[PDB]
Amino acid sequence: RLLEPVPFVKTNNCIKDVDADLFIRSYATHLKLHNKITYPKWCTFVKTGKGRKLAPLNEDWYFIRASSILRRLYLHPDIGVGFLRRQFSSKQRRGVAPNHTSLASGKILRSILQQLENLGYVEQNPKKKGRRLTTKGENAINNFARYINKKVYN
Amino acid sequence: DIKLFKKWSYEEINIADLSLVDCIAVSQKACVYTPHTAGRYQKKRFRKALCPIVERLVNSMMMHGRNNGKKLKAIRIVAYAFEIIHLMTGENPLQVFVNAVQKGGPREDSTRQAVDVSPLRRVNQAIYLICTGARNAAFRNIKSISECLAEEIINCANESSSSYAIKKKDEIERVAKANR
Amino acid sequence: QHILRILNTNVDGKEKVIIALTAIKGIGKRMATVICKQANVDPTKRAGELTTEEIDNIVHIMSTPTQFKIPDWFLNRRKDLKEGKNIHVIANQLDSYLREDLERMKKIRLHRGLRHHWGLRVRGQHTK
Amino acid sequence: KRVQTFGKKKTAVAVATVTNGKGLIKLNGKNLDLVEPYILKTKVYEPLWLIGSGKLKNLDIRIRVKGGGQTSQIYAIRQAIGKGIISYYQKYVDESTKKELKDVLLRYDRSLLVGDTRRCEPKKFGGKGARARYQKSY
Amino acid sequence: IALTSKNLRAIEKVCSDIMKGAKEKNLNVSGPVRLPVKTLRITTRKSPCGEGTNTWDRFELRIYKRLIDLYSQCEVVTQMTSINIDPVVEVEVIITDS
Amino acid sequence: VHPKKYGQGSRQCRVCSNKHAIIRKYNINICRQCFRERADIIGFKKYR
Amino acid sequence: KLNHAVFIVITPSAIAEKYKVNLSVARAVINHLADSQKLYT
RNA sequence: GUGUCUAACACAAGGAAGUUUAAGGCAACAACAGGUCUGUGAUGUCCUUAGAUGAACUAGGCUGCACGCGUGCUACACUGAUAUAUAUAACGAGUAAAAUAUGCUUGCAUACUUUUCCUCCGCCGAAAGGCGUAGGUAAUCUUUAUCAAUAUAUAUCGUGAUGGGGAUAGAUUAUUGCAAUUAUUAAUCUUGAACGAGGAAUGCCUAGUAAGCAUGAUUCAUCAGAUUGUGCUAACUACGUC
C-alpha cells in the first residue's frame, strides 16, 4: 500500500517520484507552518464549484488546493486560470435532467495563483500564456520530494 | 513459479469431477501473477474453457447494473474475499473457491424431461449462483459484497444448505428428479 | 443524559450536530455548514452532548445573520419586496409568510396566484 | 545507441525507446512507479519478472504514450515493453537468447507479443448502440 | 507552393508535373508534403417528407492539400508556376527565397 | 413593414425560399430536400 | 434497529455485529485498537 | 479427416488476420390506389383573387387541462452518496449590423472606427457573469503529446425515505433579444413529493460488441432530457434449433 519492492531504477528527486496526495498535504502543512499562505477571511465561507454545491469539509482545504495547484504547475509549465478552471472540473447533476461538466470557482484559483506569485513561487512572463515556476519554489519542492523519498526508503 | 497477487501459490490440485479439473484454471498458462489479461473468449465453442477462472469470477462479479464495467473493483472484491476466507480458515482461498465451484455445479437439470449438465456449464452456473447469492446478501444489508462472496464460498465449499448455490442446486436437481 | 433534545421540541440526539440542525431547516447543508463554522463546533460530534449555550449560539446565528460574515447572496428572504428591507425569515415564519405571499398574489391577481388558487403547477404539468 | 518499437490496443499507442543503460524505466516525464491502479501496476511489472534484473541492467527504457484510457494504455505499454525487450536482444545481444526470451514471454501470454484484434464498430441510425435498437411498439 | 484540390488524380498529375518542372531549371526542392485531409461531411436524412424508418446517409466532400517548396529566386518560381498550371487545382505561391 | 433581423424569418433555403430543414452547416443555406438533388453537382459523394 | 449507542478477527462489519453498533463506531474501535477500504491483515 | 471421394466441407498447424477478415455503401423483377401538391417558377383540375383564402402588421394561441395510451430521461442506495487526489479521449468545430467623433434642435443629421464565429491569456466577480486585450481563411491560434466523464486511491456517513431521491415551491443576480409577464435560459440560498427494484404484458442483443459512462455535431439571436456521430470503461451465454 504505502511502499512495495520493485526491480527498476527511479529518478528519486521530483514530483514524478512522489505520492501526489502525501506530497500535497505535506507541502500545504509546511506552507501553513511557515505562514506565508493565508486563507483568507471570505474564503472560509465560499463554495468550490457548482458541480459540488458543497465544499471540502476539512478547514485546511485552501492550503491543500494551493499545494495541488503547485503540483499541476510542476507538471504543466505555462498554464493559466481558464486551464485551472477546466483542470478542477467535474460533472454536475442537472436535477431530473442528465449531467454536464462544471468548473471549479474561479476566484479561489485566481487568489491562489496571485498569492503564490506574491510569495514568489511563480512568475508571469511577457512570453507565452500564464505563470510558470520560480527556481526557489522548484528547489523546495525537490527538497520535500527528497525528504519523503528518504522517509519511505529507510 | 506463478502466484496470485504475488501471494497465493495455487499449484495444488483438487480431485473434482475430472472434467471440472480440465475446465478450471489448473494449467500454468491459465495462471497469472494478478488477475486480468482478457483474451478473446468468444470465438469458438470451447474457447471459454481457456479463460482464467479468476477472470471468469471477476466478470461474474462485474455483472448487474451498477457493477457493469468495474473490473478493477470486481478484482478488489475477490482479493478482499480471499483475505476473509484465509482468516476464517487457514486454507488457500483459491483451493476453497475451486471446492465451492465443484460443489455448486448441478448434476441434472429440468426441461419440457430432465438432462445432464456440461462441466463447463456447471462451472459457469456455479460461479453465477455464488455471485448472484452474494449480491442478494449484499443488497440493503450490513454485509459487504466481499464478505458475502467469502461467506457464500465457505458455505458452498463446506456443503451447507444455507448456501444460496447449494439450495438452488438442490432445488434444481430435486425438481428434475421429481419429473424424471 | 446522552441523547438530549433540540429546537422547538425535536428529539434528535444521535444525529451529528450538522445532521440534527439540517433536520430543522438548512438541509441544502451549506446553511448548516456555515452555521457550524460560525458556532465553531465540531461537525463530527453527536447532537445530544451539546450544552444549551452551544445550541443557543446556533439559534442566535440562524435567527440573526446580521452580525456574522454572511453575504446577501447567501441569505434566506434576500430583499423582501418593500423599501423596508428584512432578511432571513426562516422556518415556520417563512412558511407563514409564504402563505401570506400566495394570499397577496391571489388578491392582486397574478398568474401564479391564480394557479395556486386553482391548484395548478406554476411550471405546469404539461398535458398529462 | 537506440532501438525502437511500439504497442497498440484500441486508440492507445505506447512507443518504446530502449537505449544502452543501467535499469531506468520511464513513462513520458514520469517514472514507471506512477501507473497507479494496483492491477495495472502488476500488468507492467509482469515483463520485468519474465526477463529478470540482470538482463534489464544494461538497458534503459523510456516509453511515450498517446491515446486511450488507463487499461488500454497499460496493455499498450506492456506490449511495447515485450517487443522492446526482444528488439534489444535482436539488435545488440543474440538471436538465440532472444528466442529463449520470446519462449518465456509466449509461455506467460500472447498479448505482450501480438496486439489486440478488437476495434470499434460504428453507430448506425435507429439505436444508441452499434447494433442495439430503440423499442418497437403496438 | 501549396496545391489544394478535391480530386486525387489531378493533384497527383500536378505532382509529377512539378517534379519535372523543378528539374527543368534544376531547382533545390523539399519533397511534397501532404497536409491532413479535411472532409466536408453532411449526414443527411433520406426522404423529403421524413417518411418511414429514419434512415440517414453520409455525404463527403474530401479536399486534399499538399505543399512543395523551393529555395530559388522569386522570378524563377512565378514563371515556373505559370508554365505548370492546369485549371482544376488551387495554387498558392509563398516563396520569397533567393 | 417592420423588420426582424434574427431568428426564423432572417433566413431561408437559397434555392426554394422555404424556411424548413435548412443546412447552415459550412454555410450551405439549402434545405436538405433541395440539397440532395444538387449535392453531386456541388461535389459531395456518399461512401458510408 | 437497536444497533447504535455511544457507551459500553479485524474487520468493521464483524465488530459492528459483535458489539451491536454502527460501522462508524466500529472504525473508531479499529482506530483505538491500532493505537475506500483498508488492509486488516 | 469427411465429401459421388467431384463441386466442396470439417478440424488442427502456420499466420497480423482464415466465414467473402469485421463493418459499411450500391439494392433487380414486379407491385402497393403507403407517404409527400406545407421543399421546389414540378403540376392538372377546383375554389378564391382588393370591406382578398394574396402580401403586410399588432396582440392571443401552438407548452391549455376531470383524463387515456406510445417513446425517452431520472430514481429507488453502501460494489453507494459526499469531498479531495490520480489518470486521461476520439470524431469535431470555428470571422451588414453596432459603437465612437463632429454640426444642428434629451432628439436628429453628418463624419469615422470597431465588435460580429471560436475564445486562450490578465484583471474583477461565491457564483453565474463582467471588463481589458492576443491568435485564428486554420495540422499553425482557440486546442487537442491533451479538450470528457465512468475509472481508480485516501478520507466522511453507516441501512434509518437515511446525509437515498430531486419532483414541487419561494425568495436573487445575471444572459440572449424590441419583447421573457404561461416559472425563456442561468446560477445562489432555502423548500425535500412520489418512489422500499415494478403486476398482466413486452424490447433489444453473440465480441471491443451488450451495458455503463461521457462528449462533438444538428437545429441556435435565444436551447438537449431529442437525433446523429465519436470515444473510454470491456460483461454474461449458447456458439445453435425449427
Side-chain angles (χ1 to χ4, degrees), chain D residues 88-102:
Chain D
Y88 198 90
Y89 277 69
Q90 182 60 90
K91 181 171 179 176
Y92 298 108
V93 192
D94 197 282
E95 322 84 77
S96 59
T97 306
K98 187 215 75 174
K99 186 179 176 66
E100 293 165 8
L101 288 172
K102 188 171 182 290

Side-chain angles (χ1 to χ4, degrees), chain E residues 3-8 11 35-40 60-66:
Chain E
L3 297 311
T4 304
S5 189
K6 60 88 173 182
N7 186 261
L8 74 176
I11 200 163
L35 277 295
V37 186
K38 297 171 187 170
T39 188
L40 284 51
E60 286 192 62
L61 171 53
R62 300 172 177 172
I63 53 173
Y64 306 103
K65 179 178 179 178
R66 196 171 66 227

Side-chain angles (χ1 to χ4, degrees), chain C residues 14 46, chain G residues 3-35 38 40:
Chain C
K14 183 60 170 66
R46 300 283 173 173
Chain G
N3 51 288
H4 22 74
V6 183
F7 299 108
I8 301 178
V9 182
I10 309 175
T11 179
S13 303
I15 300 296
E17 190 61 68
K18 192 172 182 179
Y19 280 170
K20 308 286 181 175
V21 297
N22 306 109
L23 271 66
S24 39
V25 181
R27 282 158 54 251
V29 172
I30 291 173
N31 299 336
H32 292 198
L33 183 62
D35 185 59
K38 300 175 65 55
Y40 306 107

